Design a protein around this ligand. Sequence first.
Ligand SMILES: *C/C=C1/C(=C/c2[nH]c(/C=C3[NH+]=C(/C=C4\NC(=O)C(C=C)=C4C)C(C)=C\3CCC(=O)O)c(CCC(=O)O)c2C)NC(=O)[C@H]1C
Ligand SMILES: *C/C=C1/C(=C/c2[nH]c(/C=C3[NH+]=C(/C=C4\NC(=O)C(C=C)=C4C)C(C)=C\3CCC(=O)O)c(CCC(=O)O)c2C)NC(=O)[C@H]1C
Ligand SMILES: [Cl-]
Ligand SMILES: [Cl-]
Ligand SMILES: [Cl-]
Ligand SMILES: [Cl-]
Ligand code: NI
Ligand code: NI
Lengths: 322, 322
Amino acid sequence: DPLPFFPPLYLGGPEITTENCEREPIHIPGSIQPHGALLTADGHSGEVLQMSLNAATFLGQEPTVLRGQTLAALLPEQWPALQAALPPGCPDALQYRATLDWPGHLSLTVHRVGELLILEFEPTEAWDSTGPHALRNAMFALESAPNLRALAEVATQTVRELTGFDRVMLYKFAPDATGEVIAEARREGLHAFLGHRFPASDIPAQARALYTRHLLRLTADTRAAAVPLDPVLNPQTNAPTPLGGAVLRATSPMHMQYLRNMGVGSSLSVSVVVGGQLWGLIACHHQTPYVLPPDLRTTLESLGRLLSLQVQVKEAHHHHHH
Amino acid sequence: DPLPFFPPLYLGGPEITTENCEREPIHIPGSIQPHGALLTADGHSGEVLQMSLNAATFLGQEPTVLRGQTLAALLPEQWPALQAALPPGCPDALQYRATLDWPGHLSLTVHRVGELLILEFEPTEAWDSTGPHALRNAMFALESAPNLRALAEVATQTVRELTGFDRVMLYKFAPDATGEVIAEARREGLHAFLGHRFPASDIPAQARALYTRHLLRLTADTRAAAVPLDPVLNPQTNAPTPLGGAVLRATSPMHMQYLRNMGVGSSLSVSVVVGGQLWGLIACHHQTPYVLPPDLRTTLESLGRLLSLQVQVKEAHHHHHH
Ligand SMILES: *C/C=C1/C(=C/c2[nH]c(/C=C3[NH+]=C(/C=C4\NC(=O)C(C=C)=C4C)C(C)=C\3CCC(=O)O)c(CCC(=O)O)c2C)NC(=O)[C@H]1C
Ligand SMILES: *C/C=C1/C(=C/c2[nH]c(/C=C3[NH+]=C(/C=C4\NC(=O)C(C=C)=C4C)C(C)=C\3CCC(=O)O)c(CCC(=O)O)c2C)NC(=O)[C@H]1C
Ligand SMILES: [Cl-]
Ligand SMILES: [Cl-]
Ligand SMILES: [Cl-]
Ligand SMILES: [Cl-]
Ligand code: NI
Ligand code: NI
């Protein structure tokens, strides 16, 4: 039951401190991480409504010829497919993805919130692709684990092999929202977090709520400044643009400072949701900035949903055995 | 508890009839389907030991310069990766896959059985690739189904949308190994199989056993003649080559005739395995020959494993509710 949100900073809201941080509106920061570009567009006309200020870098055109243009003119072969994939009223977690050939390779991810389309562009390399075999072969390791703790251990090992992150943890929530690191895979030489417990305030209630609905989030560079959207309010509504479903969403500054204090250069986590409840997180750290490729991110998200069912079977089974 | 196998035809075994078909050694036919090529190689040296007779068509070289050559000479950039992915003693269901650029596009799938590597080559198109989003977006439909029958219905619909097959069924086994079509998605105009029940003999006991360990099999063209391996016995062992893990494995002639009698041009199914037991099949038909691309096959296999956990949760839940 999260408390109501403060207005965001660009609407005159208060500065966030350790006394009020449960009220930070982390889903509407009005800004993005600088390794990609974001546009929003009207879901019926395709008119481009908002754009991140760095969009000319990634899209090779100044906003003058971008704002107010339609996606039918900018993305003529993707526009019909985009409409078919994200019809009105669809879930905001549903996504459309394409790989564009831009005068290099741009990855395009789209989702729909109400009557708005949110388009994320980020550079990708030809060798950055990941086939379905990555997930397929990983399912064998997970199904042979004999109990819940063994399942957690093999899961962290599997995620570290797929990604190369310096540290991968399984963080389990207790009934009071405190957490414990119940499994960990880490680079040789890094100190262990295995078995450590943390207070509920390190992941506040409005973050836990968001993480029950949008399953993956990341900070690619913990010392990068965010890039504003322009205009900052959605012209359709005269209200903030919901970015909870955008991986390019700017991270809370409170969390960015937390990560820097830990010596973390890049961070990523995936929700494990069991029976509609946030059960835990697959939590990853790198010592330097690192952008995990889009195909590998989607694989990790799918692995999280698999792990959720495996947890739910084991918990059901060792509850039914009693 | 399947009865012991007859020797295969090329070892002097008897002809298979409706009186003895539970003894057909379907895993060692000594032949493959003609839309791809197969090689076997020593798992340590990489020496090429057996090849399908059509291999020169797909590999552009006569067997004279193929047999006895090493994979280090033929596939110099794949050979080291192949060894790392399939170490001695690994599961025979574990697979390695690459996309080769051949003087067009060849898909390469490798698995290991004992000390033998089995390599399958098949042509593929650049537009035949399937990203991880296909499986990711399909998971949403499956998790919202309220009960087991609804889960079956949405699953068949999802598989038909991904593949375009004329008919997709969910076939559930009863405790006596008879089966029932409990859900079906089909092209407009095709008669329904929904609700029909079939005898246990249509999928005999040795097929059910094989299908508990190797989860996907297909017949791309129900009127295509199979292509022999040469030599037909594995020189390592002087014994038949196990092909249960090869999708190119020739289909039982008894089943090929069954399919032709039904008017089926192409067939494919995926096992649903629950608690180590064969629970049912996702069974697909096309009216004409059709080779589903390798990336889409692996996606269907992963969807089958997902469905198995969803079935196991629902059955556990509505057994626990009682
Ligand atoms: C007063 C507010 C505070 C606060 C806010 C906050 N924290 C997050 C997100 C996360 N916190 C995490 C905690 C940990 N990471 C670790 O490595 C460990 C132990 C080794 C802990 C306990 C995690 C994993 C997240 C999720 C994000 C990620 O994976 O990096 C947010 C939300 C960030 C966002 O999504 O924008 C917020 C607002 N944390 C505090 O400690 C207090 C000061
Ligand atoms: C005397 C032996 C017989 C026999 C053998 C046999 N059958 C299979 C495999 C399958 N049979 C299937 C049955 C059905 N397909 C349908 O569409 C329906 C109802 C609409 C049924 C009952 C299926 C689905 C399979 C799996 C393969 C596939 O998906 O096409 C085998 C094994 C084939 C192989 O893997 O090599 C064998 C040996 N079937 C008989 O009816 C008797 C005559
Ligand atoms: Cl809080
Ligand atoms: Cl109970
Ligand atoms: Cl039988
Ligand atoms: Cl009970
Ligand atoms: Ni019971
Ligand atoms: Ni109970």
